[PDB]
Design an enzyme around this catalytic site. Structure first.
Site, PDB file in Angstrom:
ATOM      1  N   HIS A 114       6.531 105.687 117.266  1.00 12.93           N
ATOM      2  CA  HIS A 114       5.249 105.071 116.913  1.00 12.93           C
ATOM      3  C   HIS A 114       4.272 105.118 118.111  1.00 12.93           C
ATOM      4  CE1 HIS A 114       2.358 102.927 114.728  1.00 12.93           C
ATOM      5  NE2 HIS A 114       2.919 101.740 114.633  1.00 12.93           N
ATOM      6  N   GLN A 136       0.924 103.039 118.615  1.00  9.66           N
ATOM      7  CA  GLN A 136       1.183 101.636 118.926  1.00  9.66           C
ATOM      8  C   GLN A 136       1.390 101.434 120.431  1.00  9.66           C
ATOM      9  OE1 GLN A 136       1.436  98.879 116.560  1.00  9.66           O
ATOM     10  NE2 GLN A 136       1.108  97.885 118.529  1.00  9.66           N
ATOM     11  N   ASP A 189       9.944  93.134 117.505  1.00  2.24           N
ATOM     12  CA  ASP A 189       9.566  93.796 116.269  1.00  2.24           C
ATOM     13  C   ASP A 189      10.546  93.287 115.233  1.00  2.24           C
ATOM     14  OD1 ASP A 189       8.497  95.614 114.312  1.00  2.24           O
ATOM     15  OD2 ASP A 189       9.390  97.371 115.393  1.00  2.24           O
ATOM     16  N   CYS A 223       4.302  94.283 117.648  1.00  2.96           N
ATOM     17  CA  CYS A 223       3.434  95.288 116.962  1.00  2.96           C
ATOM     18  C   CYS A 223       2.807  94.829 115.635  1.00  2.96           C
ATOM     19  CB  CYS A 223       4.217  96.584 116.725  1.00  2.96           C
ATOM     20  SG  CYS A 223       5.751  96.374 115.877  1.00  2.96           S
ATOM     21  N   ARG A 231      -5.466  98.723 118.815  1.00  2.00           N
ATOM     22  CA  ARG A 231      -5.147  99.923 118.039  1.00  2.00           C
ATOM     23  C   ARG A 231      -6.451 100.682 117.773  1.00  2.00           C
ATOM     24  NH1 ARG A 231      -0.581 100.224 115.024  1.00  2.00           N
ATOM     25  NH2 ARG A 231      -1.481 102.298 114.715  1.00  2.00           N
TER      26      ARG A 231
HETATM   27  C1  LIG Z   1       4.692  98.981 112.436  1.00  2.00           C
HETATM   28  C2  LIG Z   1       6.046  98.922 111.826  1.00  2.00           C
HETATM   29  C3  LIG Z   1       7.117  98.998 112.913  1.00  2.00           C
HETATM   30  C4  LIG Z   1       8.544  98.800 112.351  1.00  2.00           C
HETATM   31  N1  LIG Z   1       9.582  99.139 113.361  1.00  2.00           N
HETATM   32  C5  LIG Z   1       8.843  99.648 111.135  1.00  2.00           C
HETATM   33  O1  LIG Z   1       9.090 100.837 111.312  1.00  2.00           O
HETATM   34  O2  LIG Z   1       8.929  99.101 109.991  1.00  2.00           O
END
Ligand SMILES: CCC[C@H](N)C(=O)O
Ligand SMILES: CCC[C@H](N)C(=O)O
Ligand SMILES: CCC[C@H](N)C(=O)O
Ligand SMILES: [Cl-]
Ligand SMILES: [Cl-]
Ligand SMILES: [Cl-]
Ligand SMILES: [Cl-]
Ligand SMILES: [Cl-]
Lengths: 307, 307, 307
Positions: B131, B134, B226, B265, B293
């Protein structure tokens, strides 16, 4: 001159004074008549939808584009709210990116929370309980015909639903006489009736909630209806049977003024709540009514984004 | 001036040098502070989404619009890829119509293929493995507080997932100390760990992968978490019990610096990976982090489109 | 000169004369070569989709944006038509908000009704029966190679479907020789065949409908195919058995001219209707063909919006 409003948001029409409502209608009429200018240049309106829509979805985005801005359609099935993100967290992040939010959903409380937690304007594009942008456009449509609300009678015949609620509040605000006829068991919400009645005490509006449709439409200038099963509602087979005497048809409308006009928010189901003969007949103004969603909302948007 | 980058695409942050990353952060900070100019006039960014999103979806389209361009949302469910069209074919046809693609999906290999076969820039907006946008925004958020990456300690506590991978690579690139704590059986991918360590050799970054969360957060400047079940993972309900000792709560954060800040995040699930007390408390910066972001991505877009 | 057309709508290509089609192709070629100008400034095209799409969806919105207008994607699952609103009511309200409609759906009759009840232009972006924008772009692609339609042979081998129909009418309009080979039971619609033969009488086109693919492709300048199971079809499993002899492969194309080129509307399924060896080989022009959807439709849009 853009109307000044003492509200950040538009969730029910309770937030607006009589004078503000009239100013919005006059500004909408101006915008309808005059060449498009980019009053909302570069502004972005988020459009969150959890329910079907044709008119609200298209009119909001077209309005933004005509004003030099942008509409961003956000299907509620795609947002992280589906995966349990709070309404509050959503409000706070969207305020960093865009300039306003229009939301159509089930829970009115959710729209209240969104507005409370957002630093940008929030507009209710329909909830289970209120459809204020529709009633605002409907007031404009009535005003274009009558040039006044004084001595005008609106009769709503149908289910005591979100649209009925917003018309009750709209009529009370502008001093227009309104009657409602519903079947037993399907009255408008009693708290909303009480709020409308309280407003009407100040403005001169006569608001009456009844069960007899012939009595309700007596000497009406406008007859309004809506579907018998709204998007938020669970089905009762017995409901359709109870509603039969409430259909808008030739036999019913003859009790109104000969000069009456027919209104319907749409979408409509011919031969349920209204016959083809009425909605497609010479007293129907439903398409111009729908057109005025565009203008009335452009006035609202310009005023709310000016704050 | 606009940062020059020696890459067409942004898939993992590996593609960027330290100097390029720092230049992007500085440009993002400039864009955040200064009047919007139409640097991407007429450009169209396609936004392919196979997973839910609020922040990435809205921030990419708002960024484009604010730079005078356009974002085109493309739900993966509607694209012919859902009916078996290849990624290569999709890449080739989109390159005739639009100017860049941002894609959020499951298979990181699919995004690699899209970039290889596309003549226009491709940006990874999240895959099962990375990601990067992010983490770029997260670096910006850290830098706004500290004004340096030297001597700063970031502690990530949670699942060894896409966001963990991107933070590992980001931290290594800028020379920041990073510790990770995950449950046994949920460590970050070892090949990604090796890549980060190799980068860290050049930059002075200390990267440490651990299991005990209290040791990981010791004297940290930032604590990051997260969700325990990422979009790539719904079946795995067992996780919820295993991950309980990894919750970011009052007992854990007292081991960090008194001046630490909390990052996440989003979306967040209060009382799972973080308590309301922490995410809603005075050391949380998650909404400024989400706001960045927008700016970090606008800097990236202007640079990639400059090629 | 923008081409003048004597039609409000484009549903099948029947609405266009030979001279109009040629004028459109020339204009598309001009637009392809020359700098973008905002010919459709401010105009909004609704894009209603009830079926999957990559090329049609992206190309129509990009085309509008590149001409200074806007494309508004409207998933059919979200419109009040899903809840029973009539096509006629839909047409009358959309005409108050936007400037044209492109619709992709199942029932060709629904698109006919939308065009009839709309005061704004309607474009068929694929129905079960016709895909006229595809064949317009295909004519452009052929003309870019040949600089003429006289003496050119197109062979379509596959299912007698929407794309076959549109190619038949396109070929007949410009005077190109066209052969079709389908399995038994899967011929193009006989009424459409008759219309094409009638048009061909006036233009000099030779149209032949056959079962033998080797005969159909004999001395062809172009070979065209499409998928064996279209979006509107839930065909028997016996269909695959009947289609085995109709794959476009090395053994079949050796019967065409050595200089032939391969066409496919896309999406394609390699190793079914066409082998990788053909569609990725040196005679394939499918990606230039897809690219021309953009230019051909921009020509159409400008012409319709002018009229
Ligand atoms: C922005 C989402 C981040 C999370 N690790 C996902 O992949 O669901
Ligand atoms: C515009 C739709 C109004 C209707 N009462 C509903 O809620 O379904
Ligand atoms: C563009 C797709 C064409 C194919 N015959 C279908 O209708 O699915
Ligand atoms: Cl409801
Ligand atoms: Cl009307
Ligand atoms: Cl914050
Ligand atoms: Cl079909
Ligand atoms: Cl090609």
């Amino acid at each position: 001159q853009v109307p000044k409003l003492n509200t950040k948001d538009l969730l029910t029409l309770e937030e607006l004074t009589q004078e503000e409502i009239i100013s919005l209608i006059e500004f909408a009429i101006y915008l309808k008549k005059n060449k498009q200018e980019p009053l909302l240049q570069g502004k972005i309106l988020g459009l969150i939808f959890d329910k079907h829509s044709t008119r609200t979805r298209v009119s909001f985005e077209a309005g933004m584009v005509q004003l030099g801005g942008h509409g961003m359609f956000l299907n509620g099935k795609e947002m992280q709210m589906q995966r349990g993100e709070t309404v509050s967290d959503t409000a706070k992040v969207l305020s960093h990116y865009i300039d306003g939010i229009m939301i159509r959903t089930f829970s009115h409380a959710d729209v209240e929370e969104l507005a409370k937690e957002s630093s940008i304007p929030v507009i209710n594009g329909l909830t289970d309980d209120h459809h204020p942008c529709q009633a605002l456009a409907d007031l404009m449509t009535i005003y274009e015909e009558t040039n006044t609300f004084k001595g005008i009678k609106l009769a709503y015949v149908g289910d005591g639903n979100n649209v009925c609620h917003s018309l009750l509040l709209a009529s009370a605000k502008v001093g227009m006489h309104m009657t409602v006829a519903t079947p037993v068991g399907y009255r408008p919400n009693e708290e909303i009736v009480k709020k409308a009645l309280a407003i009407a005490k100040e403005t001169g509006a006569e608001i009456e909630i009844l069960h007899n449709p012939e009595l309700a439409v007596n000497e009406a200038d406008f007859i309004y209806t809506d579907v018998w099963m709204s998007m938020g509602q669970e089905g009762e087979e017995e409901k359709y049977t109870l509603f039969q005497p409430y259909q808008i048809n030739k036999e019913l409308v003859k009790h109104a003024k000969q000069t009456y006009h027919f209104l319907h928010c749409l979408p409509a189901h011919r031969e349920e709540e209204v016959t083809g003969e009425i909605i497609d007949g010479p007293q129907s103004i439903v398409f111009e009514q729908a057109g005025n969603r565009l203008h009335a909302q452009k006035a609202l948007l310009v005023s709310l984004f000016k704050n």
